[PDB]
Amino acid sequence: FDYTVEQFADLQILRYKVPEFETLTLKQKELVYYLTQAALEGRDILFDQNGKYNLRIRRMLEAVYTNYKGDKSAPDFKNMEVYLKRVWFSNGIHHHYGMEKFVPGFSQDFLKQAVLGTDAQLLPLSEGQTAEQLCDELFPVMFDPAILAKRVNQADGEDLVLTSACNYYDGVTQQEAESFYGAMKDPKDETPVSYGLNSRLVKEKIQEKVWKVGGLYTQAIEKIVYWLKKAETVAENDAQKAVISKLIQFYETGSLKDFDEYAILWVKDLDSRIDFVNGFTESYGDPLGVKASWESLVNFKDLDATHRTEIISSNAQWFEDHSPVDKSFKKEKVKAKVITAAILAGDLYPATAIGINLPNANWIRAHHGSKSVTIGNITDAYNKAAHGNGFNEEFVCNDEERQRIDQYGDLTGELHTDLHECLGHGSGKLLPGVDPDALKAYGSTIEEARADLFGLYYVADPKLVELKLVPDAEAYKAEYYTFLMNGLMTQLVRIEPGNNIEEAHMRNRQLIARWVFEKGAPDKVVEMVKKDGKTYVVVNDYEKVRQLFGELLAEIQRIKSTGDFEGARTLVENYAVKVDPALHAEVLARYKKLNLAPYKGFINPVYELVTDKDGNITDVTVSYNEDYVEQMLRYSKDYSPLPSVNN
Ligand SMILES: [Cl-]
Ligand SMILES: [Cl-]
Ligand SMILES: [Cl-]
Ligand SMILES: [Zn+2]
């Protein structure tokens, strides 16, 4: 199985497996199938939300790309192909992370000739429009760097609504937009709807054009609703069926009270094996933070992985009791499901998340609860795709370590994460009267260090062999080596030339690693050595490293529990911030030679329904033999119901 698909620009395309899909019942597979169809119909929605020209530009390049009869080896065509592939990755003409608009690496004359040589019937022309007019429309949008430069703008002294190419507002200023929603809000509403979540705000009166059946985007929403109605007929139980039924109504009415009702039912549906997301969910695509991008995920519970986190959870008190922290900081009584993604769509595709924490409505989270999950097969795909990429070959000090990391690194890294997330933050307590914010700007860095150290100290414990979480007592050394190598050295690849460590998690890792390095130095517990001008991290006593991790854990627990700001500051400023310029440049030059793309995204598997003569389903199969170009072209042909212009 090949986890890697292709690489272009600053992007690498991967694939993921859907483990245990074949173990589901046939009816369960049917429900997954329908939900995945409901997911795939939404792709055009996100494109349009990210820019009113995106569907035209996508469809123009797509018509050129698939019918081109010219020299496909020529640089103009190759750069146009890269551009289109970036548009597919980013669901628009702007960088999926940076928001800046892509720079075409091909000439306008080339595109003009390519467009004119395409059957005009195949171009996304409006009625009565010519190919020349479509180019006059789109070429400034594509080629002029000053036009629609950012998909989301965060700058001051600018009208962020007009300065942002996203398509949630049309002909409305930022002050008009914020005022509309500032006025609509009711402070006294204890169960407030998510004002403005599902509409374009336009001036036509400032009014809302709601995304719903019979409204804006109805061509795609109608298809989503069709497949959801199919899914409704094969629900696993009545709770999940009610979720599906309410979600259909929300799409049919556009009512935001239906959305809250749906979200309440969704949080109550905690038992079902299969779950999904399908809606306008997160609001980061909007510079005002009001409108939500469309996304979808279909999934089923990863039983084995969830069981492992439940083993960790149910032993919370054992880890607390045996902790190396001072007894006065220990909780006397102290008390994370994993899901398998079946398909990704909308703002989860192809660039996706490793965890989902929903719903967003605070009053629903407070009174009814929430679902917070991690996506095990996406995390695993990340890990598997990295094997053999050249990184450990370049930076690991010797072949024994490389062999131990290849064998155990993935397992013990994820286990360390599980310890950090399931127990590390929950462990320990403040002393009476101590302000939780006593560490001020250092609080986040110290708190993440504390949880990481809890995980590091315990990933090495023999208890974990007994508990059947690690297969033998040496496995932890893989995680120990990579944590110290990343903390002292290889995370510098994320720092720009001439800068220091800024982000809290990067700081907490350098903090831990540099402290252990300093404290172990008289016994050469950890060394940094050069061969042929390259630096390597050398670990000489793994047992002493565990003891040092424990000593720093105790010290950091004391800092937090007593509110020791000066202690926090001392640790952060002395260990966590300063970058050695020579090491930084050395690591970057070694890293850039590996040609590793900084961003990843995933293609989906392909599901097929098998029916009999009458059409009764007899099986549902999953396949992985589709690449990036194939899947994008197939989605644009078969899962692309929106008009090119949505006005
Ligand atoms: Cl415009
Ligand atoms: Cl939700
Ligand atoms: Cl490697
Ligand atoms: Zn954390």
Phi, psi of 44 (to 5 degrees): -60, -30
CA atoms within 13 A of residue 470's CA, in its CB half-sphere: 27
Tokens of 104: 């075409």
421 in a known ligand binding site: yes
Rounded to the nearest angstrom, the gap between the alpha carbon of residue 640 and the centroid of all alpha carbons in its chain is 24
- Identify the nearest ligand to the CA of 505 by its number: 4
What's the 399 CA to ligand 3 centre distance in angstroms? 11
What's the 421 CA to ligand 4 centre distance in angstroms? 6
What's the 362 CA to ligand 2 centre distance in angstroms? 12
Query: CA-to-CA distance for 421 and 413, rounded, in angstroms?
Result: 12
What's the 413 CA to ligand 4 centre distance in angstroms? 14
Tokens of 434: 């101590």
Place of tokens 């999904």: 276
Query: CA-to-CA distance for 371 and 379, rounded, in angstroms?
Result: 18
Query: CA-to-CA distance for 48 and 538, rounded, in angstroms?
Result: 52
Query: Other CB atoms closer than 10 Å to residue 638's CB: what's the count?
Result: 10
387 in a known ligand binding site: no
- Ion ligand 2: residues, CB < 5 A: 358-359
368 in a known ligand binding site: no
Angle formed by the axes of helices 628-638 and 75-90, to 10°? 70
- Residue spans of the domains in the chain: they are 53-166, 391-595
What's the 277 CA to ligand 2 centre distance in angstroms? 6
Rounded to the nearest angstrom, the gap between the alpha carbon of residue 468 and the centroid of all alpha carbons in its chain is 30
What's the 281 CA to ligand 2 centre distance in angstroms? 6
Per-position DSSP letters for 223-274, written without gaps between them:
HHHHHHHHHHTT-SSHHHHHHHHHHHHHHHH--HHHHHHHHHHHHH--S-SE
What's the 353 CA to ligand 4 centre distance in angstroms? 16
Long-range contacts of 307-313 (CB under 8 A, 24+ apart): 308/418, 308/469, 309/336, 309/337, 309/338, 309/418, 309/422, 311/467, 311/468, 311/469, 312/418, 312/419, 312/422, 312/423, 312/469, 313/422, 313/423
6 in a known ligand binding site: no
- Cis before 432 (ω within 30): no
- Ion ligand 3: residues, CB < 5 A: 392-393
Query: Nearest to residue 423, comparing CAs of 315, 511, 324, 269?
Result: 315
Contact 180, 213 (CB under 8 A): no
Q: What angle do CA 529, 534, 539 make, to 5 degrees?
A: 35
For 170-216, the three-class secondary structure string (H helix, E strand, C coil) is ECCCHHHHHHHHHHHCCCCCCCCCCCCCCEEEEECCEEEEEECCCCE
What is the separation, in whole angstroms, between the first and last Cα of the chain?
Answer: 44
What's the 360 CA to ligand 2 centre distance in angstroms? 7
